[PDB]
Design a protein around this motif. Structure first.
Motif, PDB file in Angstrom:
ATOM      1  N   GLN C  18       0.859  -1.217   0.000  1.00 39.59           N
ATOM      2  CA  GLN C  18       0.000   0.000   0.000  1.00 39.59           C
ATOM      3  C   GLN C  18       0.884   1.254   0.000  1.00 39.59           C
ATOM      4  OE1 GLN C  18      -4.186   0.190   2.221  1.00 39.59           O
ATOM      5  NE2 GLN C  18      -2.525   0.977   3.496  1.00 39.59           N
ATOM      6  N   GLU C  19       0.494   2.303  -0.735  1.00 44.15           N
ATOM      7  CA  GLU C  19       1.261   3.579  -0.687  1.00 44.15           C
ATOM      8  C   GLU C  19       0.625   4.533   0.326  1.00 44.15           C
ATOM      9  OE1 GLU C  19       4.118   4.072  -2.291  1.00 44.15           O
ATOM     10  OE2 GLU C  19       4.068   2.205  -3.449  1.00 44.15           O
ATOM     11  N   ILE C  20       1.374   4.958   1.347  1.00 41.28           N
ATOM     12  CA  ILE C  20       0.842   5.746   2.450  1.00 41.28           C
ATOM     13  C   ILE C  20       1.667   7.010   2.607  1.00 41.28           C
ATOM     14  CG2 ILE C  20      -0.072   3.737   3.635  1.00 41.28           C
ATOM     15  CD1 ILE C  20       2.248   3.915   5.552  1.00 41.28           C
ATOM     16  N   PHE C  21       0.989   8.113   2.906  1.00 42.87           N
ATOM     17  CA  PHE C  21       1.607   9.420   3.068  1.00 42.87           C
ATOM     18  C   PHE C  21       1.572   9.819   4.532  1.00 42.87           C
ATOM     19  CE2 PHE C  21       1.931  10.923  -1.334  1.00 42.87           C
ATOM     20  CZ  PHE C  21       1.157   9.986  -1.971  1.00 42.87           C
ATOM     21  N   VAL C  22       2.721  10.213   5.070  1.00 48.98           N
ATOM     22  CA  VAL C  22       2.810  10.604   6.471  1.00 48.98           C
ATOM     23  C   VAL C  22       3.566  11.917   6.583  1.00 48.98           C
ATOM     24  CG1 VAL C  22       2.723   8.215   7.182  1.00 48.98           C
ATOM     25  CG2 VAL C  22       4.902   9.327   6.865  1.00 48.98           C
ATOM     26  N   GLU C  23       3.771  12.387   7.808  1.00 50.20           N
ATOM     27  CA  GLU C  23       4.445  13.653   8.045  1.00 50.20           C
ATOM     28  C   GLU C  23       5.952  13.494   7.914  1.00 50.20           C
ATOM     29  OE1 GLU C  23       2.641  16.409   8.719  1.00 50.20           O
ATOM     30  OE2 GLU C  23       0.923  15.903   9.989  1.00 50.20           O
ATOM     31  N   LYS C  24       6.618  14.617   7.665  1.00 59.69           N
ATOM     32  CA  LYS C  24       8.025  14.635   7.285  1.00 59.69           C
ATOM     33  C   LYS C  24       8.928  13.953   8.303  1.00 59.69           C
ATOM     34  CE  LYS C  24      11.716  17.981   7.133  1.00 59.69           C
ATOM     35  NZ  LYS C  24      12.016  19.426   6.973  1.00 59.69           N
ATOM     36  N   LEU C  25       9.598  12.884   7.888  1.00 57.73           N
ATOM     37  CA  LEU C  25      10.586  12.199   8.703  1.00 57.73           C
ATOM     38  C   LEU C  25      11.976  12.694   8.334  1.00 57.73           C
ATOM     39  CD1 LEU C  25       9.214   8.619   8.118  1.00 57.73           C
ATOM     40  CD2 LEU C  25       8.448  10.249   9.806  1.00 57.73           C
ATOM     41  N   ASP C  26      12.984  12.225   9.060  1.00 59.53           N
ATOM     42  CA  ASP C  26      14.356  12.632   8.786  1.00 59.53           C
ATOM     43  C   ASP C  26      15.086  11.642   7.889  1.00 59.53           C
ATOM     44  OD1 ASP C  26      13.766  14.767  10.375  1.00 59.53           O
ATOM     45  OD2 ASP C  26      15.055  14.177  12.050  1.00 59.53           O
ATOM     46  N   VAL C  27      14.496  10.471   7.678  1.00 55.65           N
ATOM     47  CA  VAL C  27      15.129   9.455   6.847  1.00 55.65           C
ATOM     48  C   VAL C  27      15.261   9.887   5.393  1.00 55.65           C
ATOM     49  CG1 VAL C  27      15.060   7.052   6.102  1.00 55.65           C
ATOM     50  CG2 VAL C  27      14.254   7.684   8.380  1.00 55.65           C
ATOM     51  N   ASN C  63      10.273   6.509  -0.496  1.00 55.39           N
ATOM     52  CA  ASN C  63      10.228   6.760  -1.928  1.00 55.39           C
ATOM     53  C   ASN C  63      10.523   8.198  -2.318  1.00 55.39           C
ATOM     54  OD1 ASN C  63       9.847   4.352  -3.231  1.00 55.39           O
ATOM     55  ND2 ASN C  63       7.611   4.447  -3.187  1.00 55.39           N
ATOM     56  N   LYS C  64      10.026   9.177  -1.566  1.00 59.07           N
ATOM     57  CA  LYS C  64      10.208  10.574  -1.925  1.00 59.07           C
ATOM     58  C   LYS C  64       9.844  11.453  -0.742  1.00 59.07           C
ATOM     59  CE  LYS C  64       7.457  13.072  -4.583  1.00 59.07           C
ATOM     60  NZ  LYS C  64       6.641  13.425  -5.777  1.00 59.07           N
ATOM     61  N   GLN C  65      10.631  12.504  -0.545  1.00 54.51           N
ATOM     62  CA  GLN C  65      10.258  13.640   0.281  1.00 54.51           C
ATOM     63  C   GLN C  65       9.722  14.742  -0.620  1.00 54.51           C
ATOM     64  OE1 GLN C  65      10.963  13.600   3.739  1.00 54.51           O
ATOM     65  NE2 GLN C  65      12.159  11.712   3.786  1.00 54.51           N
ATOM     66  N   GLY C  66       8.771  15.505  -0.111  1.00 55.66           N
ATOM     67  CA  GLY C  66       8.135  16.491  -0.951  1.00 55.66           C
ATOM     68  C   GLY C  66       7.508  17.640  -0.207  1.00 55.66           C
ATOM     69  N   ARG C  67       6.575  18.302  -0.890  1.00 58.49           N
ATOM     70  CA  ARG C  67       5.811  19.416  -0.344  1.00 58.49           C
ATOM     71  C   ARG C  67       4.429  19.375  -0.972  1.00 58.49           C
ATOM     72  NH1 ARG C  67       9.036  24.845  -1.275  1.00 58.49           N
ATOM     73  NH2 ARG C  67       7.746  25.716   0.409  1.00 58.49           N
ATOM     74  N   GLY C  68       3.392  19.413  -0.138  1.00 58.44           N
ATOM     75  CA  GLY C  68       2.035  19.217  -0.599  1.00 58.44           C
ATOM     76  C   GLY C  68       1.521  20.362  -1.448  1.00 58.44           C
ATOM     77  N   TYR C  92       5.794  16.300   3.257  1.00 58.22           N
ATOM     78  CA  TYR C  92       5.330  14.940   3.484  1.00 58.22           C
ATOM     79  C   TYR C  92       6.420  13.941   3.118  1.00 58.22           C
ATOM     80  CZ  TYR C  92       4.604  14.569  -1.532  1.00 58.22           C
ATOM     81  OH  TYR C  92       4.782  14.542  -2.891  1.00 58.22           O
ATOM     82  N   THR C  93       6.161  12.677   3.453  1.00 61.87           N
ATOM     83  CA  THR C  93       7.012  11.545   3.114  1.00 61.87           C
ATOM     84  C   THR C  93       6.130  10.412   2.626  1.00 61.87           C
ATOM     85  OG1 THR C  93       8.486  12.145   4.930  1.00 61.87           O
ATOM     86  CG2 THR C  93       8.841  10.051   3.859  1.00 61.87           C
ATOM     87  N   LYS C  94       6.528   9.771   1.534  1.00 60.40           N
ATOM     88  CA  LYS C  94       5.763   8.681   0.949  1.00 60.40           C
ATOM     89  C   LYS C  94       6.520   7.374   1.109  1.00 60.40           C
ATOM     90  CE  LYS C  94       5.282   7.850  -3.457  1.00 60.40           C
ATOM     91  NZ  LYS C  94       5.197   6.383  -3.633  1.00 60.40           N
ATOM     92  N   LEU C  95       5.839   6.362   1.636  1.00 62.63           N
ATOM     93  CA  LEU C  95       6.457   5.075   1.903  1.00 62.63           C
ATOM     94  C   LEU C  95       5.624   3.979   1.265  1.00 62.63           C
ATOM     95  CD1 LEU C  95       6.477   6.700   4.972  1.00 62.63           C
ATOM     96  CD2 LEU C  95       8.407   5.174   5.086  1.00 62.63           C
ATOM     97  N   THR C  96       6.191   2.778   1.226  1.00 69.69           N
ATOM     98  CA  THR C  96       5.470   1.601   0.768  1.00 69.69           C
ATOM     99  C   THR C  96       5.720   0.462   1.741  1.00 69.69           C
ATOM    100  OG1 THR C  96       5.061   0.117  -1.105  1.00 69.69           O
ATOM    101  CG2 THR C  96       7.324   0.832  -0.756  1.00 69.69           C
ATOM    102  N   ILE C  97       4.640  -0.166   2.193  1.00 71.24           N
ATOM    103  CA  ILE C  97       4.715  -1.187   3.228  1.00 71.24           C
ATOM    104  C   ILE C  97       5.073  -2.524   2.603  1.00 71.24           C
ATOM    105  CG2 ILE C  97       3.470  -2.352   5.077  1.00 71.24           C
ATOM    106  CD1 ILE C  97       4.056   0.771   5.252  1.00 71.24           C
TER     107      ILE C  97
END
Lengths: 143, 37, 100, 53, 50
Positions: C18-27, C63-68, C92-97
């Motif tokens: 699943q592709e999920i969007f969360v708040e900005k991490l440092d990774v 996957n990517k750091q960005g700006r909404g 934001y930060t986009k990840l894949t589980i």
RNA sequence: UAACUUGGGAGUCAGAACAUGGGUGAUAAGGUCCGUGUUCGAAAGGGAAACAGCCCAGACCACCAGCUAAGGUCCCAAAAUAUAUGUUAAGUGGAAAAGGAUGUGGCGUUGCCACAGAGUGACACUGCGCCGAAAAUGUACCGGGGCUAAACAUAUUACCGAAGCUGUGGAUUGUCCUUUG
RNA sequence: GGGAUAAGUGCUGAAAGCAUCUAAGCAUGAAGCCCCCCUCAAGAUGAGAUUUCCCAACUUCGGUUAUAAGAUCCCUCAAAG
């Protein structure tokens, strides 16, 4: 943004029958207005209608508590100057019992383009029979 | 019959009953009959 | 097999791939993260409890750091010469589980 | 107020006249003679029914 | 009396829903072979032929 | 955590309601003139049906996140057709007095065990009701349907509820540098 | 003319051994209320009922097509306007 909404494609509807025998006018009306509106199923979907059809039977047997059969007046106006009419809740029931139940339940549904379409799912008939045998209306017991 | 805010007895015979949520005074002498106190 | 993680002061339902969007991490992008607070493991798998399950980490790749998408914060008060205009872009930060 | 009096097209509407009486019914011609007048113009359709009162 | 408000392009274009002329309603003549008005003469050459 | 002192630049001189002390008026007025507080003016949000001034509370920005305030939980409309014990039959609740009355609960004080047998009459002090109660386009003084408990007094237990507090990201400005941050 | 009522008049009857039109119950009682009398009225979107009339040709659309029962353009008119 993981929230589920329900569309016309995924909605089904059941048919129920409620008996008005030995029931208060305002204690029965309140429970029927939560079935038509669909607040008993998990997919509420306020934009869409999800309610169920209900069939009232024996609507003459409806009972009022205390001196109401002669002390509750239903008023109406016809827009002509001086024309304002009234009829006592006793006489209404000995005359047109379908109307009594049907104008108490509708004063509990919202007044919008969508509450007008949920008031058309209410069928009221005084006799112990009903002409809707073509569906499979299962009984619902008021709590 | 005489209708007045105050209804009180006038003779030994007069009596005070209540009909239909109103207080009246029946009595023999028809001049003593009063209602709605 | 779905789980309920708790990342950014919020909770998220998660499924494999699943592709999920969360708040900005440092990774950094292209790295691999991990979630140490899982609340509910269920569905096909065994129903479990809380406050927090024992162990049970969830892993994902960044996957990517960005700006909404940009919005504009305008307000005013009528008959009083008072306005204000501001912009905003939330990162934001986009990840894949990939392992629940 | 709804129900005011104003100009507008008048006449053309169904009218009844009650309690009229028959005089002579003249078979061989099929004409009746009714005591009084009857609404409508000539060559127009009229109905005749027994009184309700 | 004077108008209190202006009239929009929408309310102006609804009024003229009915402001149109109709078809003259003509037929071909069985001599001229040219469209003519009904119950009139053929202008191209006059032959009513009642 | 403010104070005073000297210099630069100002605006203001028509105020309003609400509570509490008083003049004046008639122990009249959203009247008016003073003292003392707060809110509006210059203040958004939640409740009071709508309603600058009343009860709660002071918005740096983003969020399909949590715990609360006033006010609330039968349906419109989010959360108890919750629990225990009592009252009220008037739709009181959901406008108003002098006075009138075998309405009904309490509490006492008593005279006589008869009054026409089991009981009987006279008084205070109080809870909740009844009459007194008549206006002009249309019900029209619960926001509506409706209610005999979904009304009222007393006591607990949960739940909803704001731009308040918190949780996680970001932005400027000052103080300290517990780690050139 | 029938139906249900207002102020009044009662009959039976207790709470209160009697008395009492009321609390349970049973009546009577107005130019007023509701039907009767007279027009309008199925856009009453809850769109009702009744008797009659018409009803095959082309398709790979699963739909098209004109023509049927019928109604109009146009013309002569008034009992209408």
């Amino acid at each position: 943004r993981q929230t589920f909404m329900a569309n016309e494609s995924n909605i089904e509807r059941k048919w129920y029958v409620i008996d008005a025998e030995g029931q208060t006018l305002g204690r029965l009306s309140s429970e029927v207005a939560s079935i038509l509106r669909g607040k008993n199923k998990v997919t509420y979907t306020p934009h869409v209608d999800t309610g169920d059809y209900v069939i009232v039977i024996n609507a003459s047997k409806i009972e009022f508590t205390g001196n109401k059969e002669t002390d509750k007046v239903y008023y109406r106006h016809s827009n002509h100057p001086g024309g304002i009419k009234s009829i006592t809740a006793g006489e209404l029931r000995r005359t047109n019992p379908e109307r009594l139940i049907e104008n108490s339940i509708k004063g509990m549904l919202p007044s919008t383009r969508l509450g007008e379409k949920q008031g058309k799912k209410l069928f009221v008939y005084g006799g112990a029979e009903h002409p809707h045998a073509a569906q499979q209306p299962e009984n619902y017991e008021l709590r | 019959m005489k209708v007045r805010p105050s209804v009180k007895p006038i003779c030994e015979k007069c009596k005070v009953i209540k009909r239909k949520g109103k207080v009246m005074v029946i009595c023999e002498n028809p001049k003593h009959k009063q209602r709605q106190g | 097999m779905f789980a309920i993680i708790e990342t950014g002061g919020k909770q998220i339902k998660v499924e494999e791939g699943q592709e999920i969007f969360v708040e900005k991490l440092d990774v950094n992008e292209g790295d691999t993260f991990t979630f140490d607070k899982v609340l509910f493991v269920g569905g096909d798998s065994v129903k479990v409890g809380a406050p927090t399950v024992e162990g049970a980490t969830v892993t994902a790749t960044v996957n990517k750091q960005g700006r909404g998408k940009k919005i504009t914060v305008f307000t005013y008060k009528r008959r009083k010469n008072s306005k204000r205009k501001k912009g905003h872009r939330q990162p934001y930060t986009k990840l894949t589980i990939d392992k629940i | 107020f709804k129900g005011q009096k104003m100009p507008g097209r008048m006449g053309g509407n169904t009218v009844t006249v009650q309690n009229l009486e028959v005089v002579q019914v003249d078979t061989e011609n099929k004409v009746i003679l009714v005591k009084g007048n009857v609404p409508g113009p000539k060559k127009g359709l009229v109905e005749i029914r027994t009184s309700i009162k | 009396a004077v108008p209190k408000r202006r009239t929009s392009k929408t309310r102006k274009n609804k009024r003229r829903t009915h402001f149109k002329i109709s078809v003259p309603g003509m037929t071909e003549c069985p001599n001229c072979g040219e469209y003519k008005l009904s119950h009139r003469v053929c202008k191209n050459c006059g032959s009513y032929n009642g």
